[PDB]
Structure 1
Amino acid sequence: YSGPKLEDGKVTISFMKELMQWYKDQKKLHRKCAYQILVQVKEVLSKLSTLVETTLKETEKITVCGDTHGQFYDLLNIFELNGLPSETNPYIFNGDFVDRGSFSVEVILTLFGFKLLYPDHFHLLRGNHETDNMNQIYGFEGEVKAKYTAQMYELFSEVFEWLPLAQCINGKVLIMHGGLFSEDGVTLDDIRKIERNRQPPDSGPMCDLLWSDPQPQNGRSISKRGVSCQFGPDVTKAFLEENNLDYIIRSHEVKAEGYEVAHGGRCVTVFSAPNYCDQMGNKASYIHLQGSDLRPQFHQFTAVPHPNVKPMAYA
């Protein structure tokens, strides 16, 4: 084995650079290194609140990315366009890092490594695909079994249970994978109090955070996905007012331009998997926020070449 090795058992920036090149070249991180990253990141994540609260000073910025779905070569493109993560270049990846795309192992271990390297500046929120029943079906479990073992997959599954469910910036912008709730009256403190270290239930706030979608008309509708709901602009307005928020940022739906701004400004979708499944032909985007101006700034990007492995090859 001549691949990347941790230094004194820890991630360093040189390790991360070596890992990204190793993965670009389609090689595998040694299982002992992968294991170390997973046990360390489980410990880091298990200390976090279900609601991560982040303050951006006036001169600070943060980048918000939506789903990435194992599109590792597109993830590298994000870092090339926008800079590597660092204490002065923070990131939030808003769930759905795995499944569908066939470089899910590379995406997730790269993201976990950066979480370890910059724990206060690199943030990962859970998506509906960071769950066992979805991974069983949509590629990630197959991919982990092919590259490592069933035991490694069980460890991933346990780490995913500790991913936080939402993040609030400056008490003003709330970020979650799916959306808002099937019932009125949910507060930020209710979100803080969710015991999240589990597979999601099929109803309730934890389910909604990972699964809901906005709809244009007022009200709520039964979701076409079979779980959670669609929520209208009235739902969003009431939630923002009770919680003294400005708007939400969510992901969870593919958008041809990489983003959408619904509910009159109040519900933003960002989606960071361009040409999803090598077929959708969509652009992707990421958002910049700044402590002096929390309004979203959108940066669009398009897909880059990857090795010839088909999406869902492991599903």
Structure 2
Amino acid sequence: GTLKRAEELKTQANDYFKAKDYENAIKFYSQAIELNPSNAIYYGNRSLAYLRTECYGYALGDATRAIELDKKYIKGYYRRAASNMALGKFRAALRDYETVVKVKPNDKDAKMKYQECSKIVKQKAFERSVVDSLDIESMTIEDEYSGPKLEDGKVTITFMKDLMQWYKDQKKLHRKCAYQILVQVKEVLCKLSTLVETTLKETEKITVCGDTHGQFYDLLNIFELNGLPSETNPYIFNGDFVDRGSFSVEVILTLFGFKLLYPDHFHLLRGNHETDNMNQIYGFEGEVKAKYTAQMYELFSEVFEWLPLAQCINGKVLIMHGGLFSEDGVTLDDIRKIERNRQPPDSGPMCDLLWSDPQPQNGRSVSKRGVSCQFGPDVTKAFLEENQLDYIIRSHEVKAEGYEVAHGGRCVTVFSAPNYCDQMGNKASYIHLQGSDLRPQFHQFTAVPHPNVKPMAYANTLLQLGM
């Protein structure tokens, strides 16, 4: 049976799915969908696996197919909403939750889902600089606060070593200090150019890390295994400092600490999760609001807008979070000229730097995440050789080994978040480069125990089916 063979595959895809092997779930769903392209559940199941792998575009596309095949398939609306919700398209999500409430539930759909999504549309709807409404010495520190403070308004190593111990014991930095770091780090960032250029002389090294996503205790592990950062042991962190993991405030503040302390040897590049759109959805906004205030968060939003988009070492190896572009003939000079200080456009070189992905085959296709593009080896080569560059480094995608090398070694991916979301079982990796040898050495590391906190504990209840 063609149809029975397909159901055989489907059952196998559910098995992979319930044990977090989403890449194989997707493959054995697509095999089933090939044998039978006309079953809404197959499209619903796969949509969820795409959702859990952050492929919101393909997730949306499959959910649509499921709904069309079966107007009464309720999980279709749930997963299409979850997909639009994942891109923060909450109006379009509402209209699906709406469609389920009038198939007559007084359910978890009715008063929970539809109502809470409507609240988010509404809170969105409400919406000078926020640096203004701030007063430094007006804020004041208590008799009973036994925590880290700035030494005469500046960051020091004693401060940073105290900060991490404080955070290791699940304790909060005092807000005046937090505001002090953000006010200054915005000052440092807004001076820089969209494209940052470092020289790594003859004998110098540099450690390039990928996504960290608020897994603070893995950020320490990195620092405990590869040593603390300095002007002799520089680091680059390639976006996605926050969201998903529930210690994102701990991560971002320590990364902002070292950046003020070593402005020429610690570099932060903007990721797609350094953005209001993603922060409101995947935990960071909630975490900042829970531990500080909405004003602190709006400050965080402003400082991220000044985060540089790419980094070019020695005119040879270029670095971004996402990847390369929707259009040919993009150079390093083009990147330098981007007016970064804002939220990224729905399409463009700014959008691409934060969002795009490599694909094996030549040319371009609309991205599986529903934003930017997938770009082939020919697009990578044409770009790299137009700028006499050797190879790019990027992150953005989770790898089971912690890294991957592709496009015939012209496109490298590095990922620094092990056991991603406490579930993927992946290893993580960081890269050693050097001036004499502009070439990657991949160290891999495993996850380290943390306090009993679910990932996305500060995020809305409505993207929990998409975890």
TM-score range, shorter chain: over 0.9
> What SS does the aligned partner of 2:346 have?
coil
Q: CA RMSD in A?
A: 0.4
Once residues 206 and 439 of structure 2 are traced to their aligned partners in structure 1, the CA distance between those partners, rounded to angstroms, is: 12
For structure 1, the residue ranges without an aligned partner over 5 or more in a row are none
> What SS does the aligned partner of 1:106 have?
helix
> What SS does the aligned partner of 2:438 have?
strand
Q: Which has the larger strand fraction?
A: 1
Once residues 315 and 222 of structure 2 are traced to their aligned partners in structure 1, the CA distance between those partners, rounded to angstroms, is: 27
> What SS does the aligned partner of 1:240 have?
helix
Once residues 58 and 102 of structure 1 are traced to their aligned partners in structure 2, the CA distance between those partners, rounded to angstroms, is: 40
Once residues 372 and 170 of structure 2 are traced to their aligned partners in structure 1, the CA distance between those partners, rounded to angstroms, is: 38
Alignment of 1:156-305 (within 5 A): 156-305=300-449
- Per-residue deviation at 1:2? 1.1
Once residues 334 and 439 of structure 2 are traced to their aligned partners in structure 1, the CA distance between those partners, rounded to angstroms, is: 26
Deviations 1:69-107 (A, max 9, x none): 000000000001111000000000000000000000000
Once residues 113 and 247 of structure 1 are traced to their aligned partners in structure 2, the CA distance between those partners, rounded to angstroms, is: 30
Higher relative contact order (CA 8 A, sep 6+): 1
Once residues 334 and 314 of structure 2 are traced to their aligned partners in structure 1, the CA distance between those partners, rounded to angstroms, is: 18
Once residues 198 and 12 of structure 1 are traced to their aligned partners in structure 2, the CA distance between those partners, rounded to angstroms, is: 30
Matched with 1:51 is 195
Once residues 277 and 270 of structure 2 are traced to their aligned partners in structure 1, the CA distance between those partners, rounded to angstroms, is: 14
Once residues 300 and 206 of structure 2 are traced to their aligned partners in structure 1, the CA distance between those partners, rounded to angstroms, is: 27
2:275 is aligned with 1:131: yes
Once residues 186 and 304 of structure 1 are traced to their aligned partners in structure 2, the CA distance between those partners, rounded to angstroms, is: 41
> What SS does the aligned partner of 1:186 have?
coil
* TM-score of the superposed pair, with normalisation by structure 2: 0.67
Q: Which has the larger helix fraction?
A: 2
- Per-residue deviation at 1:171? 0.5
Deviations 1:48-80 (A, max 9, x none): 010000000011000000000000000000001
- Per-residue deviation at 1:224? 1.1
Of 117, 121, 131, 2:265 maps to 121
For structure 2, the residue ranges without an aligned partner over 5 or more in a row are 1-144, 460-467
Once residues 159 and 295 of structure 1 are traced to their aligned partners in structure 2, the CA distance between those partners, rounded to angstroms, is: 32
Once residues 13 and 190 of structure 1 are traced to their aligned partners in structure 2, the CA distance between those partners, rounded to angstroms, is: 37
- Per-residue deviation at 1:4? 0.2
> What SS does the aligned partner of 1:137 have?
coil
The structure with the larger Rg is: 2
Alignment: residue pair count: 315
Once residues 227 and 263 of structure 2 are traced to their aligned partners in structure 1, the CA distance between those partners, rounded to angstroms, is: 17
Deviations 1:131-181 (A, max 9, x none): 001000000000000000001000000000000000001100000000000
> What SS does the aligned partner of 1:138 have?
coil
Runs of 4+ in 1 over 2 A off after TM superposition: none
- Per-residue deviation at 1:251? 0.3
Once residues 441 and 314 of structure 2 are traced to their aligned partners in structure 1, the CA distance between those partners, rounded to angstroms, is: 17
Once residues 301 and 312 of structure 2 are traced to their aligned partners in structure 1, the CA distance between those partners, rounded to angstroms, is: 25
Once residues 280 and 202 of structure 1 are traced to their aligned partners in structure 2, the CA distance between those partners, rounded to angstroms, is: 29
- Per-residue deviation at 1:221? 0.7
Once residues 265 and 245 of structure 1 are traced to their aligned partners in structure 2, the CA distance between those partners, rounded to angstroms, is: 13
Deviations 1:19-53 (A, max 9, x none): 01000000000000000000000000000010000
- Per-residue deviation at 1:212? 0.2
